[PDB]
Amino acid sequence: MALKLEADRLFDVKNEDGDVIGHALAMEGKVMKPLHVKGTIDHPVLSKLKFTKSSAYDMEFAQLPVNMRSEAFTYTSEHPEGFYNWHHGAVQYSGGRFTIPRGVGGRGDSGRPIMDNSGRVVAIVLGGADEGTRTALSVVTWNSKGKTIKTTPEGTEEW
């Protein structure tokens, strides 16, 4: 039945020698990536754009080229408790926190989006704090009025 054919929305950010140290994404008309991730966007067009910084939220962004604006994720500010999806599997959202099993997130996971079954982005991963058998994520989300919010658990380590 299904072939996972999708637009080019998620991009790699590499370090000086070329290791993937994070991710950048096309969403709501912008290319955004965590500010703490110091590398270059592995894309001939995106890497030449002028990026605006937002230290208060660990975000760095630029406007999408007119063309690419269609190849992009849609965000949603509604996240009822339950399970969500990301590159490594299930992400649980309960208690105001997004958690994953311990020993799963780390370098390379910054900038990865957490999604719902309808394919909308619900949050962007920044780092994590292990608490017991789980890891609580430091994520960026936006509220219903479009305000950016940043939740960082105690002892979070940036990925």
Side-chain angles (χ1 to χ4, degrees):
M1 283 295 122
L3 303 170
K4 203 215 223 303
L5 257 163
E6 286 137 353
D8 282 345
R9 291 138 141 198
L10 198 71
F11 311 93
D12 296 341
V13 175
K14 304 190 172 173
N15 57 15
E16 216 182 272
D17 66 89
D19 290 308
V20 172
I21 65 178
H23 294 89
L25 67 68
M27 169 167 90
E28 298 294 20
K30 304 168 180 157
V31 202
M32 52 194 82
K33 65 166 282 289
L35 176 69
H36 80 258
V37 188
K38 308 303 181 167
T40 325
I41 296 189
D42 193 12
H43 195 301
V45 178
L46 302 188
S47 64
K48 305 223 88 184
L49 307 178
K50 190 194 303 87
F51 280 78
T52 297
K53 159 185 183 148
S54 176
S55 313
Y57 303 105
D58 197 15
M59 288 300 298
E60 180 158 48
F61 61 94
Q63 178 209 257
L64 274 181
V66 278
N67 161 232
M68 304 184 213
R69 301 210 194 108
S70 36
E71 268 81 54
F73 294 97
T74 303
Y75 185 78
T76 194
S77 64
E78 302 308 292
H79 341 129
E81 291 198 4
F83 280 95
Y84 291 84
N85 325 268
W86 87 314
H87 189 251
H88 303 285
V91 184
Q92 178 189 233
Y93 183 58
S94 307
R97 301 142 49 92
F98 287 104
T99 56
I100 52 176
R102 171 187 293 258
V104 177
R107 229 196 37 178
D109 297 319
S110 258
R112 308 197 99 119
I114 295 163
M115 8 242 302
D116 67 9
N117 299 336
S118 49
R120 295 172 296 181
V121 182
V122 143
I124 291 174
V125 179
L126 297 177
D130 296 325
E131 303 178 10
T133 51
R134 302 184 71 60
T135 305
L137 311 166
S138 173
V139 290
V140 163
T141 45
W142 289 264
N143 64 214
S144 302
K145 288 299 279 192
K147 188 186 78 69
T148 302
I149 289 166
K150 182 178 155 285
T151 302
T152 298
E154 182 200 297
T156 291
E157 82 212 301
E158 292 180 334
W159 298 336

